[PDB]
Amino acid sequence: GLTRRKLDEAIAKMEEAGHQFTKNNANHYSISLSEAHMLMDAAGVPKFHER
Amino acid sequence: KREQTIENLYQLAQLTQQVQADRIEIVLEERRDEHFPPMSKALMETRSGLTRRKLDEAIAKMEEAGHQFTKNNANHYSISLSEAHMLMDAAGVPKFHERKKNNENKPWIINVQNQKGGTGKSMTAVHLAACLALNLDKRYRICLIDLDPQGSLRLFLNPQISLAEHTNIYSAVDIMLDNVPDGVQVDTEFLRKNVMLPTQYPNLKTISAFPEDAMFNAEAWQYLSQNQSLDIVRLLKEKLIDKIASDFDIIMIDTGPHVDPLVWNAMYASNALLIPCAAKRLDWASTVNFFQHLPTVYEMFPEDWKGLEFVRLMPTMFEDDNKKQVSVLTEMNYLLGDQVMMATIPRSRAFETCADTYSTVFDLTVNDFEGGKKTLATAQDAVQKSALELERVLHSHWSSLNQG
Amino acid sequence: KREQTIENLYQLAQLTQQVQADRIEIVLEERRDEHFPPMSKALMETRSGLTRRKLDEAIAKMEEAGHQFTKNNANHYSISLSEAHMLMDAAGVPKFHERKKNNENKPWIINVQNQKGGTGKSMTAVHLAACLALNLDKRYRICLIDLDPQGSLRLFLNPQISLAEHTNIYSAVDIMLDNVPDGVQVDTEFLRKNVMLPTQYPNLKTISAFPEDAMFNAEAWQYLSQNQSLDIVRLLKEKLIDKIASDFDIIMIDTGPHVDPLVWNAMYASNALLIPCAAKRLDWASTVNFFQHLPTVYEMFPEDWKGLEFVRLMPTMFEDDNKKQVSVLTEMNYLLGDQVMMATIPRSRAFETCADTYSTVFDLTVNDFGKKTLATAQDAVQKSALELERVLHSHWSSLNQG
Amino acid sequence: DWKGLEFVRLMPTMFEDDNKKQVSVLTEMNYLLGDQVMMATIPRSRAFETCADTYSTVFDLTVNDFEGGKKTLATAQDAVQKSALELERVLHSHWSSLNQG
Ligand SMILES: Nc1ncnc2c1ncn2[C@@H]1O[C@H](COP(=O)(O)OP(=O)(O)OP(O)(O)=S)[C@@H](O)[C@H]1O
Ligand SMILES: Nc1ncnc2c1ncn2[C@@H]1O[C@H](COP(=O)(O)OP(=O)(O)OP(O)(O)=S)[C@@H](O)[C@H]1O
Numbered sequence: 001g002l003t004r005r006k007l008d009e010a011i012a013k014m015e016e017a018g019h020q021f022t023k024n025n026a027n028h029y030s031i032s033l034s035e036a037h038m039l040m041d042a043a044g045v046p047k048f049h050e051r
Numbered sequence: 052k053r054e055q056t057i058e059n060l061y062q063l064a065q066l067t068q069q070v071q072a073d074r075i076e077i078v079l080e081e082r083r084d085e086h087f088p089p090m091s092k093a094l095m096e097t098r099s100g101l102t103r104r105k106l107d108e109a110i111a112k113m114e115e116a117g118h119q120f121t122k123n124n125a126n127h128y129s130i131s132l133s134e135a136h137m138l139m140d141a142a143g144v145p146k147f148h149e150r151k152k153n154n155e156n157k158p159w160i161i162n163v164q165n166q167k168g169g170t171g172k173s174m175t176a177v178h179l180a181a182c183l184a185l186n187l188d189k190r191y192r193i194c195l196i197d198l199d200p201q202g203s204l205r206l207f208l209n210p211q212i213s214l215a216e217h218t219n220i221y222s223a224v225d226i227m228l229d230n231v232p233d234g235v236q237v238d239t240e241f242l243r244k245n246v247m248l249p250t251q252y253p254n255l256k257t258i259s260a261f262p263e264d265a266m267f268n269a270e271a272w273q274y275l276s277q278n279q280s281l282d283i284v285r286l287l288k289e290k291l292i293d294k295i296a297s298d299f300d301i302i303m304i305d306t307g308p309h310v311d312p313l314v315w316n317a318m319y320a321s322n323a324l325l326i327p328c329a330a331k332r333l334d335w336a337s338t339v340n341f342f343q344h345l346p347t348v349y350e351m352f353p354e355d356w357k358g359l360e361f362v363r364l365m366p367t368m369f370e371d372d373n374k375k376q377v378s379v380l381t382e383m384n385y386l387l388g389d390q391v392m393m394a395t396i397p398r399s400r401a402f403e404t405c406a407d408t409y410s411t412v413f414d415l416t417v418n419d420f421e422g423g424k425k426t427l428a429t430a431q432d433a434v435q436k437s438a439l440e441l442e443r444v445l446h447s448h449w450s451s452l453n454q455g
Numbered sequence: 456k457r458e459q460t461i462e463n464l465y466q467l468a469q470l471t472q473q474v475q476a477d478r479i480e481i482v483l484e485e486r487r488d489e490h491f492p493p494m495s496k497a498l499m500e501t502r503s504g505l506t507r508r509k510l511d512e513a514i515a516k517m518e519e520a521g522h523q524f525t526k527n528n529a530n531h532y533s534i535s536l537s538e539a540h541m542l543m544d545a546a547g548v549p550k551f552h553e554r555k556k557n558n559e560n561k562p563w564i565i566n567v568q569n570q571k572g573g574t575g576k577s578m579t580a581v582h583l584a585a586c587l588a589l590n591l592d593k594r595y596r597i598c599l600i601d602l603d604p605q606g607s608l609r610l611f612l613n614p615q616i617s618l619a620e621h622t623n624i625y626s627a628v629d630i631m632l633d634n635v636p637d638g639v640q641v642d643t644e645f646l647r648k649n650v651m652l653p654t655q656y657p658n659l660k661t662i663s664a665f666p667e668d669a670m671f672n673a674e675a676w677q678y679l680s681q682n683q684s685l686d687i688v689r690l691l692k693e694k695l696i697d698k699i700a701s702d703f704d705i706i707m708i709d710t711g712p713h714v715d716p717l718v719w720n721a722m723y724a725s726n727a728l729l730i731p732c733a734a735k736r737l738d739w740a741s742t743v744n745f746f747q748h749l750p751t752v753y754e755m756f757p758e759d760w761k762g763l764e765f766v767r768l769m770p771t772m773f774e775d776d777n778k779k780q781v782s783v784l785t786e787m788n789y790l791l792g793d794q795v796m797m798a799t800i801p802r803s804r805a806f807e808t809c810a811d812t813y814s815t816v817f818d819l820t821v822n823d824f825g826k827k828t829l830a831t832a833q834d835a836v837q838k839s840a841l842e843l844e845r846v847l848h849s850h851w852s853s854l855n856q857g
Numbered sequence: 858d859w860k861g862l863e864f865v866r867l868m869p870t871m872f873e874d875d876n877k878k879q880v881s882v883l884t885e886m887n888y889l890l891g892d893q894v895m896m897a898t899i900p901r902s903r904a905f906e907t908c909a910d911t912y913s914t915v916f917d918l919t920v921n922d923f924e925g926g927k928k929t930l931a932t933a934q935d936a937v938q939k940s941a942l943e944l945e946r947v948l949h950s951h952w953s954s955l956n957q958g
């Protein structure tokens with residue numbers, strides 16, 4: 001449920017760190033499930049409890 | 052000065068005489084050339100619910116009778132919808148207007164009103180009504196009202212069939228005024244004659260509407276000029292509701308995207324409340340305005356009416372996979388839970404195809420269109436489980452709202 | 456025994472004014488903190504139609520003043536939208552009105568009207584108007600009227616950037632209702648300082664709409680009871696149109712989906728009608744019903760308007776590949792050709808983003824994020840704007856002469 | 858003996874659709890002989906060049922033949938076909954007039 005602009009904001013906040021968004025056989029960003037968790041953990045979306 | 056705009060107003064004319072043409076060709080083009088879907092000994096099982104043994108017994112009892120059964124190109128049995136309702140008529144299975152448990156009941160008035168344009172009330176509600184009519188085990192006598200002067204419910208393949216033989220008619224307007232021949236009194240026989248019409252189903256019925264119905268609002272402003280007690284509210288109640296409550300059990304009512312004197316009467320006189328809506332923000336904001344506007348207005352209506360017994364909201368055009376709209380649905384379930392239906396009405400190209408040929412989902416089968424099967428399958432199954440859950444609200448309230 | 460019913464309705468209303476406040480908070484979080492994406496100095500040549508030498512002349516005349524052409528992350532001149540407006544305001548290019556040849560103009564008074572709803576009134580009008588805004592070579596001034604009681608253009612990237620110098624932002628109905636301090640009168644000065652607000656487009660303003668507008672239907676019903684002269688129609692025109700045409704070149708009246716006293720008032724007031732009717736067969740049936748109803752109603756009206764000027768039915772949410780709907784376009788073209796627009800507003804997810812995010816097609820750029828999808832989105836929208844505004848000349852020459 | 862031609866219209870061509878001068882010219886034409894000039898636009902793209910070089914008209918070749926100048930050719934053929942039906946609709950409305958002269 002993250003709009004494209006929100007997801008680009010999240011990856012602009014995240015990617016400059018040491019993390020690399022692992023790509024599959026192609027360049028397509030193959031964000032692992034844990035990668036997605038971390039991304040939206042620090043993306044700024046409050047959890048169902050922390051909100 | 053207004054030489055060229057005599058030209059221009061009578062050229063809005065010299066174009067709407069060509070649109071008078073256009074409607075002539077529309078009538079010539081919609082004309083039926085179709086057959087109703089057959090039950091294929093498994094669709095029969097799913098829809099009617101009759102066991103194969105009892106079905107065999109009844110179709111044999113009728114086979115030795117005058118009527119003869121019919122079969123498809125293959126010897127496999129195939130029975131039409133007309134034959135279906137005939138076997139139901141002769142099944143001996145009583146209706147809610149014939150059941151010893153409850154036969155002397157009043158109409159179950161069901162309405163669909165939204166203040167938002169083009170989002171689905173017409174198509175979704177006509178689909179819901181034609182699906183509830185699929186309750187062939189019970190033979191509901193259903194009155195479809197296209198109170199929206201521009202709805203297609205008088206034209207959309209469950210229609211007010213105004214054949215060429217149809218001589219003259221007196222819409223709900225003329226029932227609000229008794230503008231029929233002054234000599235004759237409007238009795239229920241008159242109502243069958245020129246108000247209650249079939250819908251190509253021996254069970255489902257309808258009323259038609261016309262753009263002249265817009266003149267009702269002007270006449271209501273005129274009556275406000277000649278009246279100050281807002282008594283036009285009860286005009287609907289006595290003219291229509293008291294005359295129709297004796298001999299029908301359900302009345303489907305579409306009202307239109309608008310809130311207006313006509314629609315105020317529709318709101319009030321009706322003894323049940325349904326609220327169609329989508330999952331969009333602005334729609335639910337309009338519903339907030341609606342929930343502010345009503346209470347004061349109900350205070351305006353006569354005190355004799357002790358409020359509507361139940362209030363529920365609807366989905367529509369619900370893509371079911373958009374984050375914003377599912378969040379809206381969660382919020383609604385968070386606020387008015389148990390007063391909002393869970394069932395979802397999805398949007399797919401199958402509905403577009405249905406509309407373009409005017410044919411409701413039931414009128415056409417897989418051979419008619421592409422493999423939007425499961426989409427239509429789950430559409431009709433959600434509409435039918437939703438019909439029985441709204442009718443189960445009505446069941447639990449057949450203690451309350453029938454005694455008020 | 457309506458105690459339960461009414462108190463329960465108030466309980467929904469009470470928990471739901473909370474939802475209204477929650478939406479306001481969602482705005483506050485979403486409030487821009489940014490402005491319209493700037494131009495690249497090549498889109499300058501493309502849309503503003505100024506040759507490189509002319510643009511260097513303009514910036515030679517301007518830049519030596521206190522103004523600085525703000526640069527982006529790089530040295531590339533990131534001329535803000537307002538910066539571009541000012542640049543070409545004083546560059547020496549005469550506006551579409553100030554240009555000597557055309558200064559006795561009858562402004563366009565456009566309508567998007569369909570008594571059947573869900574056909575795309577507000578979004579078609581706002582996409583069209585916003586694209587018209589970005590014709591800089593002659594710096595079109597545009598005007599958009601949200602006259603729908605449930606309308607949502609207020610925060611729609613023509614948003615509530617409301618200079619508090621205005622006494623209050625009164626909605627179009629509240630101009631009709633006169634919910635104003637009685638001291639001030641309806642004058643262009645009052646409108647300028649108290650009514651309309653900027654919309655990120657110096658070429659555009661809006662006349663607002665709040666939920667309580669719906670009661671004006673009842674109010675005008677009571678008025679029609681008061682008198683039957685039907686003069687109520689002239690209210691809109693006389694009070695508002697004559698005074699607001701001063702500051703703008705093109706006027707659009709979004710009548711909304713209703714057919715209510717408001718919209719008879721508008722129909723009579725409005726003198727040019729677009730009909731954004733998505734051609735879908737049942738939509739076209741409801742609009743054939745439309746085309747019975749309006750001839751009678753218009754026939755009923757008095758003798759002080761120059762009718763309408765044209766109709767360009769723009770099929771909204773169109774696809775061009777759906778066999779049935781493209782066929783429906785063919786019947787459009789055939790049954791009623793010579794009166795319909797050839798191009799289309801193709802259905803794209805960009806438009807749904809436009810709608811839900813309370814945005815417009817142009818105020819977000821490709822960098823805002825789509826990609827090719829929305830790129831072709833505004834490509835089609837801007838070709839449609841070219842075609843539309845060409846029709847605008849084609850009948851506007853008729854407007855100046857009437 | 859010839860009572861003049863029953864209808865007169867102008868065409869676009871090579872219309873880049875994004876040049877200020879040429880769109881201004883089109884606006885002026887629509888300003889002068891409106892209803893007597895087609896609205897439809899014929900854009901210019903490398904797809905037409907490829908078509909010409911192999912001699913093959915847009916219909917003779919498909920996406921597999923060339924690059925992704927798809928939508929360009931798509932909107933080219935669709936503008937040409939809606940323009941064909943609008944010129945033939947001029948001819949329809951004039952199948953009263955010019956057939957009887
Ligand atoms: N499932 C659907 N598939 C396709 N179109 C749909 C669907 N549901 C609604 N529509 C749209 O709705 C139009 C006609 O149906 P309605 O929405 O009922 O019109 P309406 O009578 O104004 O009802 P409202 O105001 O939208 S609730 C169609 O032309 C579509 O644009
Ligand atoms: N692509 C789309 N994305 C989202 N909403 C759309 C789209 N196309 C049409 N709509 C509908 O249009 C609404 C907003 O635009 P408008 O159609 O102008 O609203 P409006 O003022 O009610 O006029 P109507 O009733 O739709 S003709 C949305 O809330 C939807 O119901």
Ligand SMILES: [Mg+2]
Binds near residue numbers: 169172173199307308
């Ligand atoms: Mg409707």
Ligand SMILES: [Mg+2]
Binds near residue numbers: 566567708710
């Ligand atoms: Mg309008």
